[PDB]
């Protein structure tokens, strides 16, 4: 059963945005990622400082970033609060719509693409290096979820049969044929100390046989 939605056409906007300037500082994609993840740790803290229970579903906060040269992606694994299925539908959790108003302001007032994370939709960063992606998700008030994007204006939804989560959110990039060096340990060790040495959670670099 999969159920197949239209991106608002704002988003679709920033979607094509993003895959078709011409812009060579590819490497903030992980950045964003690595900040939404520390994002959702946070805020599956908070919750637990008042109701221990919350962590029933699992104790550690942490992120992995997992490469796979043979499937040609690399994932980011968090333990954070995860997301419903009406978060993934509203543009996964993120207030998109404004958010891609304020930044396409902010780069004809000359910006660049390097400061999405600043507006919210940090996320549509991954489309830089990857031609699909998945999200599969597991928040404590709903069961588990896979959302998936070619972008093209159309995104799916689906229940996941897969490896069962605990909590939190898993984005699987499926790069592109030219986009390979972010499989490679230390072009992804590089970009992590670069630009995401204070994040306040361990970060495990998986490494491959
Ligand atoms: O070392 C370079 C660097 C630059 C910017 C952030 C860095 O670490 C953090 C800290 C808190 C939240 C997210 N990232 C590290």
Partial sequence: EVETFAFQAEIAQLMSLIINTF???????????????????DKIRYESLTDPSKLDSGKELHINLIPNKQDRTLTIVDTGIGMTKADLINNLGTIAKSGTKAF?????????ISMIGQFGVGFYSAYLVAEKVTVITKHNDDEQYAWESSAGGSFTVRTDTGEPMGRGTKVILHLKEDQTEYLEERRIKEIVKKHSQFIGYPITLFVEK
Avoid: P, V, W
Avoid at 104 to 112: R, T
């Fill in 23 to 41: 812009y060579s500082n590819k490497e903030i994609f992980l950045r964003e990622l690595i900040s939404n993840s520390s994002d959702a740790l």
């Fill in 104 to 112: 396409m302001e902010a780069l004809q007032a000359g910006a660049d």
